[PDB]
């Protein structure tokens, strides 16, 4: 996340940190963000897993907070199912169907048990989005500049505004590389944005006064670049897909 503030407990308790395992007793490497949509299910971006789409390579952590005491029995999860969208494609600049579902369980086989620091996030009604210009909040451990290589140490959150497709599909923006299964969002002052390492993390907009996973961090030319909003998987157009993989 570029610009914005560092977060605490209960601020994004649906947030999931997704790590890739290293061989040997080497600690895993942070790979992507995610959102707890069900006690057993995390939604994230497919592009995060396309190189190594086997579930054994990942481990998910929940309830991150500076006031949360790490408990591996309840906060660490193996991935028992990793599902990428079957029509995920990489285009010239955009990703298509950039979404993935991770079924998680603890070492004793439980799903996520709610707490002050672990909550699910509600999905939008079908094809329903907050109006353009709405304030949504983004969250992650991604770079704090584009030009940086460093990932931050603690959880960050920021506020971006929804940008209409008409404005986003202007040629000096993204032109025809934005379709309606995507959602653009940016800082009107172009100083805050999500960046490398935020993919799969949430875009939380208020649907009728209720926090809602509207987007999943997917791509963008640069980070916080003028005329270049962050692009997000539009969750409202994937509800059937999602609920077809759960039930």
């Amino acid at each position, epitope marked *: 996340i570029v610009g914005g503030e560092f977060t605490e407990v209960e601020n994004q308790p649906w947030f999931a940190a997704i790590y890739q395992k290293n061989k040997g*007793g080497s*600690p895993p490497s942070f790979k992507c963000g995610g959102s707890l949509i069900s006690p057993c299910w995390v939604a994230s971006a497919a592009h995060c897993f396309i190189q190594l789409p086997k579930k054994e390579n990942y481990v998910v952590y929940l309830g*991150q907070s500076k006031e949360s005491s790490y408990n591996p029995g*309840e906060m660490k999860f193996e991935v028992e199912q990793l599902i990428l969208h079957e029509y995920y494609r990489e285009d010239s600049l955009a990703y298509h169907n950039d979404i993935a579902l991770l079924k998680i369980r603890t070492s004793t086989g439980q799903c996520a048990q709610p707490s002050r620091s672990i909550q699910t996030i509600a999905l939008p009604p079908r094809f329903t989005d907050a109006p353009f210009g709405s304030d949504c909040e983004i969250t992650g451990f991604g770079k704090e500049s584009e030009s940086d290589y460093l990932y931050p140490k603690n959880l960050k959150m920021s506020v971006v505004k929804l940008v209409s497709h008409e404005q986003c599909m202007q040629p000096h923006y993204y032109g025809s590389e934005i379709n309606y299964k995507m959602l653009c969002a940016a800082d009107p002052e172009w100083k805050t944005d999500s960046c490398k390492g935020d993919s799969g993390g949430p875009l939380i907009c208020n649907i009728e006064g209720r926090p809602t996973l509207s987007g999943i961090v997917s791509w963008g030319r640069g980070c916080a670049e003028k005329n270049k909003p962050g692009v997000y998987t539009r969750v409202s157009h994937f509800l059937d897909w999602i609920q077809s993989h759960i039930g």
Partner: nanobody
Amino acid sequence: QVQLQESGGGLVQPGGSLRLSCAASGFTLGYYAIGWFRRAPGKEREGVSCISSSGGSTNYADSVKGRFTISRDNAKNTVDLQMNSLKPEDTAIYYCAAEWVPPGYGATVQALCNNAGYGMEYWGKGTQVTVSS
């Protein structure tokens, strides 16, 4: 190729002292938080004492406060547990366990230790500590 191995087990008189050591091979133990857990013949596994990777945070079960002392040496790839004023109640199999604590949590290793060690990544096979007359 990851291996944890405890050592130091034996039979000691009540009130006596005993030191355990956990050695690692195949990986760098210094990146890991380490917990000493024990299982008594009748009870289930409980956290005795834990220490964070840098050695800055420790936790002790109430049963052993002021009697047991955990320490570590990340140059020698070990974690020690000094047991003084031993009581018969301490008689158990003592396991060493290692877990990588991700960033973004509290500095404490309290929850790592109070929860009977469920979820700890790596385990040694354990060493026997018997306190008897």
